Amino acid sequence: SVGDFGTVLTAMITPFKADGSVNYAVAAELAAHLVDNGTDTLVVCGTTGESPTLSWDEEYNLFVEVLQTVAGKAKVIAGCGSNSTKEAIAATQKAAKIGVHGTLQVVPYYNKPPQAGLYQHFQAIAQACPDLPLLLYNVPGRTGQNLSPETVVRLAEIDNIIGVKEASGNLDQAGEIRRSTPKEFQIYAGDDSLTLPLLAIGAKGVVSVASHLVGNQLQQMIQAFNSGQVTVASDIHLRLLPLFKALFITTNPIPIKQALKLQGWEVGSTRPPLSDADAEVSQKLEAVMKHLNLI
Amino acid sequence: SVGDFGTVLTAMITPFKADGSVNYAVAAELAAHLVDNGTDTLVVCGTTGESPTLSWDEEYNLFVEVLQTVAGKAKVIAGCGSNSTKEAIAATQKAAKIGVHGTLQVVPYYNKPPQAGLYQHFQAIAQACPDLPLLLYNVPGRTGQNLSPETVVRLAEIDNIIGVKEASGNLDQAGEIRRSTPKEFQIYAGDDSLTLPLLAIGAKGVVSVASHLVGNQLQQMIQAFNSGQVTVASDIHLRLLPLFKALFITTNPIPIKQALKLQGWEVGSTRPPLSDADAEVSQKLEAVMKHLNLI
Amino acid sequence: SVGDFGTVLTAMITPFKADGSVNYAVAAELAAHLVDNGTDTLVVCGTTGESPTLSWDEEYNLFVEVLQTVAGKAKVIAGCGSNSTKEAIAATQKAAKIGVHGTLQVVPYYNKPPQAGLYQHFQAIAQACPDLPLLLYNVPGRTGQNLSPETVVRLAEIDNIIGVKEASGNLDQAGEIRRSTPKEFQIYAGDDSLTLPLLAIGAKGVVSVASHLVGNQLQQMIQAFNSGQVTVASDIHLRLLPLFKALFITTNPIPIKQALKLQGWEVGSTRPPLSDADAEVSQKLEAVMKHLNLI
Amino acid sequence: SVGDFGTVLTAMITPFKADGSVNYAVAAELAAHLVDNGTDTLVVCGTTGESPTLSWDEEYNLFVEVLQTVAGKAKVIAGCGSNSTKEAIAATQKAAKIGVHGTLQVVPYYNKPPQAGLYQHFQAIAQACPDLPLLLYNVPGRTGQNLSPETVVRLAEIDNIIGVKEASGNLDQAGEIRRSTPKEFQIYAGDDSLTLPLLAIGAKGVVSVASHLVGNQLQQMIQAFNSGQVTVASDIHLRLLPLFKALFITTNPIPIKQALKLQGWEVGSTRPPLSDADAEVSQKLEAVMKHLNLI
Ligand SMILES: [Mn+2]
Ligand SMILES: [Mn+2]
Ligand SMILES: [Mn+2]
Ligand SMILES: [Mn+2]
Ligand SMILES: [Mn+2]
Ligand SMILES: [Mn+2]
Ligand SMILES: [Mn+2]
Ligand SMILES: [Mn+2]
Ligand SMILES: [Mn+2]
Ligand SMILES: [Mn+2]
Ligand SMILES: [Mn+2]
Ligand SMILES: [Mn+2]
Ligand SMILES: [Mn+2]
Ligand SMILES: [Mn+2]
């Protein structure tokens, strides 16, 4: 129950004002909107939330703003991971005290720890707040290192490590994890275009970007699937597929911020070193969004 | 009706006697076994049947023997592809007179034709026998070239091109094809571990290796899925996954031929330049099969 | 001495008439031109020679045409390899009798033999004509399988296996081969842009495509290097680099045939399934060639 | 003069005491050793120096200690990069007051900025300390993003950007940069196994790990090459290759720290989340070093 975050977890964007500061009021308005339109749980200051370029102070305040906003309607997972174990632990402890319902812990990027060091890293974070759920996040494309299924299988023996956001794109790996972990341990898709395929082999849901725009449709797809209406589910997947691709034509969260802007949200641009969507990206998104009546 | 091959297509091995010659008696006997145990359609002399090392006369003879062995009970698709278009055409013409129900046409290997060349290749084969169904076969890991979804989409406009055996591992690509092709055009998994995830996005089934051993459980998984018993399907998938992986621990069809031998089938070795399963491999296989009660 | 093929080995193109037949007279005129402009040895019916789409009869006749043309000025290596061991042996034997000075033996494409089977394949071909030099050809991008350094090191123990055309793009691998093979065993670059870097770690030269156009400059680069004029060599490399890339903007030998056509050679187009250079490719080549005063 | 760092830049390890704290005494002693044995310039707190897990105060302290230790004898380049541009700028400003001779600026890891974002990132760092040389560092395997040669070429137009540490393994990319940048802009190998091949196409030298152990032999190889003793250079390269590979058998700097320990240096372990060299690894190292007479 403490580990149940639903099926649609949205990695929320971080809106910025024109001066580049965090726009707390927009973040609140976005959080409430999401939670009323398909998001079960908000993942705050993930990758999509531009974590690398935020200060800790801005992260802390975002977690507080969202918790206040979505009190008793949605859970809140805090992006607290790092390629330094000590920094992750520090962040996790601070987030624990303000009331987050879990943390998202990325595999250490850039330094490429071996599996033994990855095991210790996640173990140490788990043990620093043994009652706080911990969601592993494997994204080799960004970190330069994959978390092996054997390592995940071992970490799932720690009671508060309650799942993995699997964004490797490798279904073999996801199935190896699923078949050797308990049911309290959940797999989430980390790519919107893989949600349906991963559901088919036992995943719980998705940590989504697209849910900012079509969260009610993702719910419908997942509920359709779980109730055995497999062709309704596939129809929705195939209909959304062009949007899912458009949302990664350049590095997330550049496209999603442009999409939201096209619907009138004042989310600002991304923060350096991320750069603004070029005209191409914007036009491709527009056409796809128009085709889906999102604008 | 004509492009309907069912859901389990088995890429049958080619058994050899101790002297290396084709064992037509075991071929027949294996074909009859398969078709009584889960296989809807037999794909003869594909990659799994060691097409590259067979003579054209051996392939012709196999087509005749299998077709006659299973006529009335199942269809036969003949592997007739090549990286020479003239050769593929000539093989396809001859298959058609034998009376087979379709051909499997690999993307040209080794020479890496551009998409325009691949389009013209397939079109010319389709046009040489305009009433014989033609199944595309995309396996970039072996050919060194990927068939693009735009190209597949254009090809599906040709009446007798009725599907693709998709062995790229790329589920976005498959989805792209599925959403832009008509329902007469079917997608088949080219990898047994991808059958369930591809089914979830609209694939028809699998061109399988594992069905030599667990055809009935594959039928059960696919039938469970289509009727909405999604957890029954994922249980089967997860239970079989170690077998699926073990069948690719070295290059197919080395493992599957060793798995068959463990069960008592006299299939012989593979032919040079494929070498025999070393002892580690056979031990891995034996353990997984024992655990599944296959020996 | 029997194994010395020089430093520039040119994988000659195969010119076709308008009706698509082999243009023997152009092949002769091209062979003589090459041998007078930097080519030490002609590699006939390689990949660049469109081997996969030629008949054996056309190959045999090309080997004869070239041998007659370049008698006592250049050696001739015959492309005789296959993914069937028996077919390679047959081809090698036939080529041996008409006087070729060696064979180029590609790693079996598409069927992905394990290393043990690759060892036996090349061993068997070597032993079928034990006095005929044999050049291994590793091109994983096209074959789907890499020949391991350990396997190459073992094959170099067979007296007539006198080197490898290394087109994997992996310099570690090339250095591992160099350091554990005798000096009678030579490494050749299989990519024109890697010739200089591979020379630096002990390669002999290149099996070149670009030599059709700048063979005298490649000689100058290699002679410059071997005489210790390293900056002359690097200058030539850097000056040719754009041509080297242009020659692979689409699949070789499509660009090189267009380049030759732009210089007035009547080489025809490629044979299906290879398709003609599109306008883009042609314009890019033109600009690069003009910039180098090749037209 | 100002961008001239010589040819061997050593990415020095950061030694730790048994309690995990930085060992400044060993740092000094190692710095002095290196600079007497082949190292022209020391790169401090790069990837090899475990930058990710050090505090900013530890890095500041290292910069001061090494600079003072080797002042008059060698230059010091400070690792100051980040995937936040504001952080890189602040670290760069502070390095400049310490009196270091340049900064090493990694491409932003994890967040995958588009090229326009990478251009703006680097430009802003360069502009924050316009008189401090800035060395680009491209290592896509760790960052998940490649710095394109067009982008590098534009950046080399900025006065103080004086080179790139190229660890992509892509020799075409390096050549593209070399031919389109002025001679004040230098290319350094980011991989010890690529030093010789990159030198052959116009690189200046290497930012090295192996120089901790064979700095003088690296100097000999590079000096041999530039004076045209090309076979002396390739002999050294080939002799060292097993060492180069062994230093990357698990993630750098795990092996190199174990190699140093085998020689008697008290460098400690790596810091979490990097784990200790298992026994197989240390045995591999020991054998190669024994064979090279390094222990
Ligand atoms: Mn942050
Ligand atoms: Mn943070
Ligand atoms: Mn909405
Ligand atoms: Mn049936
Ligand atoms: Mn055949
Ligand atoms: Mn055939
Ligand atoms: Mn019969
Ligand atoms: Mn041929
Ligand atoms: Mn042939
Ligand atoms: Mn010429
Ligand atoms: Mn010096
Ligand atoms: Mn630090
Ligand atoms: Mn730092
Ligand atoms: Mn001191």
Author numbering:
A (entry chain B), B (entry chain A), C (entry chain B), D (entry chain A): 0 to 294
Sentences from the paper on this structure:
The diaminopimelate pathway commences with the condensation of pyruvate and (S)-aspartate semialdehylde (ASA) to form (4S)-4-hydroxy-2,3,4,5-tetrahydro-(2S)-dipicolinic acid (HTPA). This reaction is catalysed by dihydrodipicolinate synthase (DHDPS) (EC4.3.3.7), which is the product of an essential gene in bacteria. The canonical bacterial DHDPS structure is a homotetramer best described as a ‘head-to-head’ dimer-of-dimers with four identical (β/α)8–barrel subunits 3725.
Av-DHDPS (7 mg/ml) was crystallised at 281 K in 16% (w/v) PEG3350, 0.4 M trisodium citrate, 0.1 M bis-Tris propane chloride, 10 mM pyruvate, pH 6.5, yielding crystals with dimensions of 0.1 mm × 0.05 mm. These crystals diffracted to a highest resolution of 1.92 Å. Consistent with the analytical ultracentrifugation (AUC) studies in solution, the crystal structure of Av-DHDPS reveals a homotetramer that resembles the ‘head-to-head’ dimer-of-dimers canonical to bacterial orthologues. Each monomer is comprised of 297 residues that folds to form a N-terminal (β/α)8–barrel domain and a C-terminal domain consisting of 3 α-helices. Close inspection of the active site shows that it is comprised of the key conserved residues known to be important for catalysis, namely Lys164, Thr46, Tyr109, Tyr136 and Arg141, which are equivalent to Lys161, Thr44, Tyr107, Tyr133 and Arg138 in E. coli DHDPS. Likewise, inspection of the allosteric site confirms the presence of Glu at position 58 (His56 in Ec-DHDPS), but also reveals that Trp occupies position 55 (His53 in Ec-DHDPS), which is common in plants but not bacteria. The presence of a Trp at this positon is likely to explain the plant-like lysine IC50 for Av-DHDPS. DHDPS from E. coli (Ec-DHDPS) and V. vinifera (Vv-DHDPS) were used as controls, given that previous studies show these orthologues are allosterically inhibited by (S)-lysine1829. The dose-response curves for Av-DHDPS, Ec-DHDPS and Vv-DHDPS are shown in Fig. 4B with the nonlinear best fits to a four-parameter logistic function yielding an IC50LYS = 0.068 mM (R2 = 0.99) for Av-DHDPS, which is closer to the value obtained for Vv-DHDPS [IC50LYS = 0.030 mM (R2 = 0.98)] than for Ec-DHDPS [IC50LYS = 0.210 mM (R2 = 0.98)]. For Av-DHDPS, there is a Glu at position 58 (equivalent to position 56 in Ec-DHDPS), which is consistent with the recently established determinants of allostery for DHDPS enzymes. We show that Av-DHDPS and Av-DHDPR both adopt the canonical bacterial structures, suggesting that the point of quaternary structural divergence between the bacterial and plants enzymes occurred after cyanobacteria evolved.
